[PDB]
């Protein structure tokens, strides 16, 4: 069920955050089985209540789960990324506006190139994990508003 | 049957354009040079070595 939003950055629950293994595993199940951003907010508040501050791996895990939550509804089956760019692997029937997609492709041909039927390559200097995260967030947010 | 050993070389003659210059050897000192194994350097003349 994980339409992976792997960005080659650590997204997990660190051992110092939650010491015992079983509570970590229970929260992994709870996060990856949650289907609404309201439920992810509930999990986040429960994490903050029972363990305090959320480290960078924990916040990356939660925002990756949120990105997957939006991507499962939209229709991106494998949104990927790295330091040099990334590949959007769509579904058989995605919900991207075609005229808008061609508009993006013609306004930035160096940052959007279709390589295959459902693979769109973007090339971006995503040197920072955070900046990559809001780049993906705004990309997908501008996608979902034009979804048909 | 016998050995099907035909892997002597691959055609590396591709991508040879004006850059190669057909090895005229008229380079002047300080002219930048690419050596595809190592990278970009500055040519500094002909020398003799043992």
């Amino acid at each position: 069920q994980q339409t992976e939003v792997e960005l080659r950055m650590p997204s997990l629950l660190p051992d110092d955050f939650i010491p015992d293994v079983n509570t970590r595993l229970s929260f992994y199940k709870r996060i990856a089985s949650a289907k609404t951003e309201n439920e992810l907010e509930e999990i986040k508040v429960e994490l903050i209540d029972r363990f305090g501050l959320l480290p960078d791996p924990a916040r990356t895990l939660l925002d990756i789960a949120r990105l997957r939550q939006q991507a499962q509804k939209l229709g991106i089956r494998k949104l990927e990324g790295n330091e040099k760019g990334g590949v959007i692997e769509f579904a058989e029937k995605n919900h991207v506006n075609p005229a808008w997609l061609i508009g993006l492709l013609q306004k930035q041909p160096q940052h959007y190139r279709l390589d295959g039927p459902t693979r769109l390559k973007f090339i971006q200097d995503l040197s920072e994990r955070k900046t990559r995260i809001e780049w993906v967030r705004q990309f997908m947010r501008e996608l979902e508003e034009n979804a048909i | 049957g016998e050995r099907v050993a035909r892997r002597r070389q691959d055609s590396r003659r591709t991508i040879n354009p004006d850059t190669l210059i057909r090895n005229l050897a008229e380079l002047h000192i300080g002219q930048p040079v690419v050596h595809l194994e190592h990278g970009v350097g500055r040519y500094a003349g002909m020398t003799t070595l043992e």
């Binding site: - | 050995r3 099907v4 050993a5 892997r7």
Partner: protein, 150 residues
């Protein structure tokens, strides 16, 4: 002497070098040291339709010595091969050394195993402790005591 002792008996030799960059020179040099032997090279970094055919020829006795990497550490049987010669055995684990020693035998013959080393002041200390342990246990069934020592 080891290679001639195996050739005159009719068996085959593993000669493990474990360095692909210089294996073509090690085999060419060994083919001058012992001209009576027929020598091939087998490692996992040459093309598939060549390694497969070399290791097929080795089964059918088309050559005696096969200068190999540790791709033969894994359990290749070849019952006629009864002499392994590990060229520089100081940097190998106990498990790897015993596995390499296990490739000879496999039949009613008596099989030797030479672990050539550098000058013993040039080895490290862990290499000395590993070699004095692999040479300490030479018995049938010593693969479990060696494991519970490792």
């Amino acid at each position: 002497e080891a290679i001639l002792r195996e050739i005159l008996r009719g068996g085959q030799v593993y000669y493990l070098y474990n360095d692909v960059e210089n294996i073509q020179k090690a085999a060419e040099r060994l083919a001058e040291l012992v001209p009576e032997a027929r020598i091939a090279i087998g490692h996992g970094q040459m093309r598939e339709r060549e390694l497969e055919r070399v290791m097929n020829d080795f089964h059918h006795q088309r050559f005696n010595v096969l200068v190999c990497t540790t791709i033969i550490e894994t359990g290749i049987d070849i019952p006629t091969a009864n002499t392994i010669i590990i060229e520089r055995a100081d940097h190998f684990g106990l498990a790897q050394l015993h596995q390499l020693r296990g490739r000879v035998g496999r039949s009613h013959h008596q099989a030797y195993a030479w672990l050539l080393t550098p000058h013993p002041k040039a080895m490290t200390t862990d290499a000395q402790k590993r070699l004095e342990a692999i040479a300490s246990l030479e018995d049938l069934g010593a693969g479990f005591a060696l494991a519970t020592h490792d």
